[PDB]
Amino acid sequence: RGSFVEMVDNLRGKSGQGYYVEMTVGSPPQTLNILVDTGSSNFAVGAAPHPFLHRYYQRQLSSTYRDLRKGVYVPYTQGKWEGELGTDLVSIPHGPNVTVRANIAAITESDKFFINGSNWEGILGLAYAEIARPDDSLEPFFDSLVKQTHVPNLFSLQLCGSVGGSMIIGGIDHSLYTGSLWYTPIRREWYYEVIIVRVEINGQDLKMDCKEYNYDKSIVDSGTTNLRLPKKVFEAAVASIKAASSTEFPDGFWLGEQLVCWQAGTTPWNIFPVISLYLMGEVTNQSFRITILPQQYLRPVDCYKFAISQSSTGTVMGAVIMEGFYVVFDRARKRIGFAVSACHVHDEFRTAAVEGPFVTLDMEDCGYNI
Ligand SMILES: NCCc1ccc(O)cc1
Prior knowledge:
The protein has helices spanning 141-148, 231-244, 294-297, 319-322; strands at 11-13, 19-25, 30-37, 43-46, 66-75, 80-91, 100-111, 122-125, 155-160, 163-169, 177-185, 193-194, 196-201, 204-205, 218-220, 227-230, 260-261, 275-280, 286-292, 298-300, 303-306, 308-311, 315-317, 325-330, 335-341, 353-359. By secondary structure, it is mainly beta. The chain is globular, with a radius of gyration of 20 Å. The chain binds 4-(2-aminoethyl)phenol. Residues 37, 39-40, 113, 115, 123, 223 line the site of 4-(2-aminoethyl)phenol. Its EC number is 3.4.23.46. The active site is at 37, 221. This is Beta-secretase 1.
């Protein structure tokens, strides 16, 4: 229940290119590296010899493959992916010792989806059916797993910022965090949606209507590199960070329009403030806060990209946030747990923190309605 030695360190990645897990599909098993994404709900894998791919799903070689005779098309601002739906037997070698029949989208055509030079060939959507394509009747992988086996309905992620981490399926491993876990309610089961109730730059409040911290929505997404903030919030966030760091920078840097560079080991972390997000707690009028460092929002590419950016889809707590914490996707109890990661990067002066309880009133007002 609190120990899963087989699953520790089962994630790999490259900075900026997400985290992937090894999976097998079909009989006999075809091994594939699969992007772990809590911000989507489709299990989709390369199914054709696209030049960027090390390997791909070869349906003809699998005796357990079943055609669903239906296509799916997933557009993005940039490009897209499109594929043919089927089901096959699925395992996770460094995961629970089970095999499940799952929906799989065999990707036959894509644009700006696969990355030139990456070691992954598909995507594992870990969120809920509501945002699955083409519709909510296509059961996501994790639902299928829970329905078909005795695996408990939760998973946890330790992302360590080349890069590594752990995906514990069906439980929590207490060696992956220190201190206590703090839980925030899943507002609605589609994305992993939560509510931010207060934001502090260097222990100083932004004094904004908290309804806008979640303008549209706030989600926990392992497929996004950045901490992403709603336009109005990003505007005020930058402004405060800008004035907090008036110790030493181009204008385009703050909009992600260019990079900023320093000499090896001369990176000024201390001229940058800590950032605290207060999340809604499990108890009426009770919240807690998570605190990340510039280590998190200044991502190396010594040249670094400012890892905070504006959005029209709301707040996104991506790898910037997640790399500081052990994160528990407690689906059975409709809540997300946060604790200090036993692997997060810090200095001798400041470390990542999860603290509570705090008294916060009108937290429901922070939740934006359709
Ligand atoms: N939710 C999609 C996450 C994603 C990001 C980048 C990429 O190339 C493919 C997928």
